[PDB]
Amino acid sequence: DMWDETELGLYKVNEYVDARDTNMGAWFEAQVVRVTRKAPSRDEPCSDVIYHVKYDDYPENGVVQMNSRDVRARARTIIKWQDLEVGQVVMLNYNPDNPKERGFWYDAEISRKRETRTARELYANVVLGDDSLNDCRIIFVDEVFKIERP
Ligand SMILES: OC[C@H]1O[C@@H](O)[C@H](O)[C@@H](O)[C@@H]1O
Ligand SMILES: Cc1ccnc(C)c1
Ligand SMILES: Cc1ccnc(C)c1
Protein backbone atom coordinates (compact mmCIF):
# COMPACT_ATOMS: atom_id res chain seq x y z
CA ASP A 1 0.00 0.00 0.00
CA MET A 2 1.03 3.62 -0.59
CA TRP A 3 1.27 5.74 2.57
CA ASP A 4 0.96 9.50 2.46
CA GLU A 5 4.20 11.17 3.57
CA THR A 6 4.45 14.70 4.98
CA GLU A 7 8.03 14.92 6.28
CA LEU A 8 10.47 13.28 3.88
CA GLY A 9 9.50 15.07 0.67
CA LEU A 10 11.64 17.95 -0.56
CA TYR A 11 8.56 19.12 -2.49
CA LYS A 12 5.09 19.46 -1.03
CA VAL A 13 1.47 19.11 -2.08
CA ASN A 14 0.35 22.00 -4.33
CA GLU A 15 3.93 23.04 -5.16
CA TYR A 16 4.97 23.40 -8.76
CA VAL A 17 8.03 21.56 -9.99
CA ASP A 18 9.70 20.43 -13.16
CA ALA A 19 8.99 16.74 -13.75
CA ARG A 20 10.72 14.42 -16.18
CA ASP A 21 8.38 12.49 -18.45
CA THR A 22 8.94 8.75 -18.20
CA ASN A 23 8.34 8.11 -21.90
CA MET A 24 10.68 10.59 -23.58
CA GLY A 25 12.97 12.10 -20.94
CA ALA A 26 12.13 15.80 -21.15
CA TRP A 27 11.15 18.11 -18.30
CA PHE A 28 7.72 19.72 -18.02
CA GLU A 29 6.12 21.92 -15.38
CA ALA A 30 3.85 20.02 -13.04
CA GLN A 31 2.04 20.35 -9.73
CA VAL A 32 2.63 17.93 -6.87
CA VAL A 33 -0.70 16.52 -5.77
CA ARG A 34 0.45 13.71 -3.46
CA VAL A 35 3.66 12.45 -1.85
CA THR A 36 3.91 8.86 -0.68
CA ARG A 37 6.26 6.23 0.63
CA LYS A 38 5.99 2.46 0.70
CA ALA A 39 4.37 1.11 3.84
CA PRO A 40 6.85 0.20 6.61
CA SER A 41 6.84 -3.26 8.10
CA ARG A 42 4.58 -3.78 11.12
CA ASP A 43 7.69 -4.23 13.28
CA GLU A 44 9.83 -1.53 11.71
CA PRO A 45 9.87 2.22 12.41
CA CYS A 46 9.14 4.73 9.70
CA SER A 47 12.72 5.90 10.07
CA ASP A 48 12.75 7.48 -0.90
CA VAL A 49 9.47 9.22 -1.69
CA ILE A 50 7.26 8.90 -4.77
CA TYR A 51 5.83 12.13 -6.09
CA HIS A 52 2.44 12.17 -7.76
CA VAL A 53 2.16 15.04 -10.19
CA LYS A 54 -0.14 16.54 -12.80
CA TYR A 55 1.47 18.30 -15.75
CA ASP A 56 0.41 21.92 -16.18
CA ASP A 57 0.10 21.68 -19.97
CA TYR A 58 -0.93 18.00 -20.24
CA PRO A 59 -3.73 17.53 -17.72
CA GLU A 60 -5.16 14.83 -19.99
CA ASN A 61 -2.30 12.57 -18.85
CA GLY A 62 -3.76 12.64 -15.36
CA VAL A 63 -1.87 12.15 -12.13
CA VAL A 64 1.45 10.37 -12.76
CA GLN A 65 3.86 8.76 -10.30
CA MET A 66 7.42 10.07 -10.36
CA ASN A 67 10.65 8.83 -8.90
CA SER A 68 12.31 11.45 -6.72
CA ARG A 69 15.11 11.76 -9.32
CA ASP A 70 12.52 12.95 -11.86
CA VAL A 71 11.18 15.91 -9.85
CA ARG A 72 13.00 19.13 -9.03
CA ALA A 73 12.49 22.82 -8.42
CA ARG A 74 11.57 24.79 -11.54
CA ALA A 75 14.49 25.96 -13.67
CA ARG A 76 15.01 29.69 -13.33
CA THR A 77 18.58 30.80 -14.10
CA ILE A 78 20.31 30.77 -17.46
CA ILE A 79 24.04 30.09 -17.64
CA LYS A 80 25.14 32.66 -20.19
CA TRP A 81 27.30 31.57 -23.12
CA GLN A 82 30.48 33.06 -21.58
CA ASP A 83 30.06 30.90 -18.46
CA LEU A 84 29.32 27.52 -20.12
CA GLU A 85 32.06 24.90 -20.08
CA VAL A 86 32.69 21.25 -20.84
CA GLY A 87 31.49 18.97 -18.12
CA GLN A 88 28.69 21.16 -16.81
CA VAL A 89 25.40 19.31 -16.36
CA VAL A 90 22.59 21.62 -17.44
CA MET A 91 19.04 21.73 -18.79
CA LEU A 92 18.89 22.76 -22.43
CA ASN A 93 16.56 22.68 -25.41
CA TYR A 94 17.08 20.03 -28.11
CA ASN A 95 14.95 18.29 -30.71
CA PRO A 96 16.23 14.72 -31.08
CA ASP A 97 14.13 14.07 -34.21
CA ASN A 98 14.79 17.38 -36.02
CA PRO A 99 17.99 18.63 -34.35
CA LYS A 100 18.01 21.98 -36.13
CA GLU A 101 14.64 22.90 -34.64
CA ARG A 102 13.22 23.88 -31.28
CA GLY A 103 12.40 20.86 -29.15
CA PHE A 104 12.09 19.91 -25.50
CA TRP A 105 14.05 20.51 -22.30
CA TYR A 106 16.53 17.80 -21.33
CA ASP A 107 19.38 17.27 -18.93
CA ALA A 108 22.68 17.37 -20.79
CA GLU A 109 26.41 17.24 -20.12
CA ILE A 110 28.40 19.76 -22.16
CA SER A 111 30.90 17.91 -24.37
CA ARG A 112 32.30 20.74 -26.52
CA LYS A 113 32.37 24.49 -26.00
CA ARG A 114 34.27 26.67 -28.46
CA GLU A 115 33.72 30.04 -30.03
CA THR A 116 35.30 30.63 -33.44
CA ARG A 117 35.03 33.64 -35.72
CA THR A 118 32.25 31.75 -37.52
CA ALA A 119 30.24 30.07 -34.75
CA ARG A 120 29.62 29.50 -31.08
CA GLU A 121 29.95 25.71 -30.91
CA LEU A 122 28.15 23.93 -28.10
CA TYR A 123 27.83 20.17 -28.05
CA ALA A 124 26.35 18.07 -25.31
CA ASN A 125 25.46 14.55 -24.31
CA VAL A 126 21.66 14.93 -24.21
CA VAL A 127 18.77 13.06 -22.51
CA LEU A 128 21.38 12.17 -19.91
CA GLY A 129 20.73 8.73 -18.49
CA ASP A 130 19.98 5.46 -20.26
CA ASP A 131 20.69 5.72 -23.99
CA SER A 132 21.74 9.37 -23.85
CA LEU A 133 22.40 11.03 -27.21
CA ASN A 134 26.13 11.70 -27.23
CA ASP A 135 27.88 14.79 -28.60
CA CYS A 136 24.86 16.52 -30.12
CA ARG A 137 25.20 19.98 -31.60
CA ILE A 138 23.08 22.38 -29.55
CA ILE A 139 21.35 25.25 -31.38
CA PHE A 140 19.96 27.22 -28.41
CA VAL A 141 23.21 28.24 -26.78
CA ASP A 142 21.77 31.32 -25.03
CA GLU A 143 19.01 29.33 -23.32
CA VAL A 144 20.99 26.86 -21.19
CA PHE A 145 19.62 26.60 -17.67
CA LYS A 146 21.24 25.78 -14.37
CA ILE A 147 19.72 22.74 -12.71
CA GLU A 148 18.21 23.55 -9.34
CA ARG A 149 19.39 21.24 -6.54
CA PRO A 150 17.83 22.31 -3.21
O1 LIG B 1 1.77 6.89 -13.10
C2 LIG B 1 0.64 6.28 -13.65
C3 LIG B 1 0.38 6.90 -14.99
O4 LIG B 1 1.56 6.77 -15.86
C5 LIG B 1 1.29 7.30 -17.24
O6 LIG B 1 2.42 7.15 -18.00
C7 LIG B 1 0.11 6.61 -17.93
O8 LIG B 1 -0.15 7.28 -19.19
C9 LIG B 1 -1.11 6.63 -17.06
O10 LIG B 1 -2.09 5.68 -17.61
C11 LIG B 1 -0.82 6.20 -15.65
O12 LIG B 1 -1.95 6.41 -14.82
C1 LIG C 1 4.46 17.18 -25.53
C2 LIG C 1 4.74 16.16 -24.43
C3 LIG C 1 5.49 15.06 -24.75
C4 LIG C 1 5.76 14.13 -23.78
N5 LIG C 1 5.29 14.28 -22.49
C6 LIG C 1 4.55 15.37 -22.19
C7 LIG C 1 4.05 15.48 -20.75
C8 LIG C 1 4.26 16.34 -23.17
C1 LIG D 1 12.06 26.89 -20.15
C2 LIG D 1 11.82 26.05 -18.92
C3 LIG D 1 11.93 26.63 -17.69
C4 LIG D 1 11.72 25.89 -16.55
N5 LIG D 1 11.40 24.55 -16.63
C6 LIG D 1 11.28 23.98 -17.86
C7 LIG D 1 10.92 22.51 -17.96
C8 LIG D 1 11.50 24.73 -19.02
Domains detected in the chain: 2-72 (2.30.30.140), 77-146 (2.30.30.30)
Solved by what technique? X-ray
Reported for 40-48, long-range contacts at CB under 8 A and 24+ positions apart, including other chains, are: 40/3
Q: Which of 18, 21, 27 best tests ligand 2's pocket when mutated (most atoms within 8 Å of CB)?
A: 21
Please report, for the chain, how many H helices and E strands are present, in that order: 0, 10
Resolution reached, in Å? Answer: 1.4
Backbone breaks in the chain after residues (C–N over 2.5 Å): 47
DSSP string, 86-105: TT-EEEEEE-SSSTTS--EE
All residues at 6 or more sequence positions from 42 whose CB lies less than 8 Å from its CB, including other chains: none
Closest CA to 85 of 116, 127, 123: 123
Closest CA to 96 of 125, 64, 60, 66: 125
121 Cα distance to chain centroid: 23
Our answer on whether the CB atom of 59 is closer than 6 Å to any ligand 2 atom is no
Cα gap 46→122, rounded to integer Å: 46
Ligand 1 center–CA 35 separation, angstroms? 16
Residue type, 81: W
Our answer on whether the CB atom of 105 is closer than 6 Å to any ligand 3 atom is yes
